[PDB]
């Protein structure tokens, strides 16, 4: 088995920038008889099936533009993207097909784009009337179009800091604007939340020394 | 124009069988080998079988030789593949793929892919989803909240399609043995609550389709 290794696992480029990944090869895939190195390279942009990108390690296919590179031979391979567009956001795989050897690919480079910084959005919404009726009550925030991704959520209940029930989800990069958005869930029973009356969700991003600050009374 | 199109993804408890199928055209599908290659949940591109141009010479890893089966029929442009043993480990979205290479030959590889199945296996049960309308207690941010379903996936549309570049959907968690996922929409303060928001959403797999009018509070 030829083991495809891609370094690193992701990374964060800014539009009209080079880009360089990296694929290492278990053992040669240079052919001798060949004189090939039987090394493919395929993107898969989100939501979509991979597309081939590269074959034989430096041949372009068809409709892919000149702006994509491959090079090296027998374990050591790069792609090279030399002005980095919004669209080439993807993940890109490289793959061996050596004849004699069962098919095998790396685990992926995930190319994201580097944008400005920007604030996240929060909005906060109380339990719907039909989710009380059946016995359950789900606080949620949504913490909009922010960048980067890392931002933290706290949930407060009549002022203490609650750590049980909570689930948070992040969004894939925006095709539009580059950004992530989160949705957070706290999650209690009718009984527990009728106990409580102030029901806060504070947002802390890179953007601000002051987090966001959303809440609701249950009145 | 080369189109792959894969259909029999579907939920299937742990032991069971299923057959997947590829509806190849554009080409001379008698020409090329096909081949199935899944993509696992951490996002792994992994091959499980291809077949020769003719349907002659058969390959597989070791991770689905016996419990698999490729095949094809080159007079209805078809590919198949028969699992059975199926393990919770073969839960991935399948691909048809299309060898690159004229019939026998080799240096060419696999160049056209499908769409995908989705393909589950587990041993929970199907339960169509809660659907609950998230509004607030210039811009007016709306939600809906999609709990307790399985499996994967739902699909939430706002004003069925109609709304919007301005739409979040946040991916699913599983939260004991059952799925929630949310959706979000900002429209303008001008359009809610004058103008009617409503959230579809369909879950294929319990036949569901649940559509939630937005209502304001006080």
């Known amino acids: 088995n030829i083991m495809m290794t891609q370094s690193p696992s992701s990374l964060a480029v800014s539009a009209g920038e080079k880009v360089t990944m990296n694929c290492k090869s278990s053992?040669?895939?240079?052919?001798?008889?060949?004189?090939?190195?039987?090394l493919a390279w395929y993107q898969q942009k989100p939501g979509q099936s991979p597309k081939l990108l590269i074959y034989?390690?430096?041949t372009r296919e068809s409709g892919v533009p000149d702006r994509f590179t491959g090079s090296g031979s027998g374990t050591d391979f790069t792609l090279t993207i030399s002005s980095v567009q919004t669209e080439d956001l993807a993940v890109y795989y490289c793959?061996?097909?050596?004849?004699?050897?069962?098919?095998?690919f790396g685990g992926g480079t995930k190319l994201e784009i580097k944008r400005a910084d920007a604030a996240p959005t929060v909005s906060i919404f109380p339990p719907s009337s039909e989710q009380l009726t059946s016995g359950g009550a789900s606080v949620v925030c949504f913490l909009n179009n922010f960048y980067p991704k890392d931002i933290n959520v706290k949930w407060k209940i009549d002022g203490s800091e609650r750590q049980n029930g909570v689930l948070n989800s992040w969004t894939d990069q925006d095709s539009k604007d580059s950004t992530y958005s989160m949705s957070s869930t706290l999650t209690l029973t009718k009984d527990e939340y009728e106990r409580h009356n102030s029901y806060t969700c504070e947002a802390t991003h890179k953007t601000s020394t002051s987090p966001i600050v959303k809440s609701f009374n249950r009145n | 124009e080369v189109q792959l199109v894969e259909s029999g993804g579907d939920l299937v408890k742990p032991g069971g069988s299923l057959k997947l199928s590829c509806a190849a055209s554009?080409?001379?599908?008698?020409?090329?080998?096909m081949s199935w290659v899944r993509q696992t949940p951490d996002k792994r591109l992994e091959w499980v079988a291809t077949?020769?141009?003719?349907?002659?010479?058969?390959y597989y890893p070791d991770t689905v030789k016996g419990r698999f089966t490729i095949s094809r029929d080159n007079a209805k442009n078809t590919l198949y593949l028969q699992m059975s043993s199926l393990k919770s480990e073969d839960t991935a979205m399948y691909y048809c793929?299309?060898?690159?290479?004229?019939?026998?030959?080799?240096?060419?590889?696999?160049?056209?892919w499908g769409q995908g199945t989705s393909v589950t296996v587990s041993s929970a049960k199907t339960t169509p989803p809660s659907v609950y309308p998230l509004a607030p207690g210039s811009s007016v941010t709306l939600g809906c909240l999609v709990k307790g379903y399985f499996p994967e996936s739902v699909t939430v549309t706002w004003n069925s399609g109609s709304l919007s570049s301005s739409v979040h959907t946040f991916p699913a968690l599983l939260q004991s043995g059952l799925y929630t996922m949310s959706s979000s929409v900002t429209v303008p303060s001008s359009t809610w609550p004058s103008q009617t928001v409503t959230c579809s959403v369909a879950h294929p797999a319990s036949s569901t389709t649940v559509d939630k009018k937005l209502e304001p509070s006080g």
């Open positions: 793929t299309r060898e690159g290479a004229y019939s026998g030959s080799s240096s060419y590889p696999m160049d056209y």
């Open positions: 554009g080409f001379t599908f008698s020409s090329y080998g």
């Open positions: 077949i020769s141009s003719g349907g002659n010479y058969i």
């Open positions: 053992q040669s895939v240079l052919y001798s008889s060949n004189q090939k190195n039987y």
């Open positions: 034989w390690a430096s």
């Open positions: 793959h061996q097909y050596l004849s004699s050897y069962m098919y095998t």
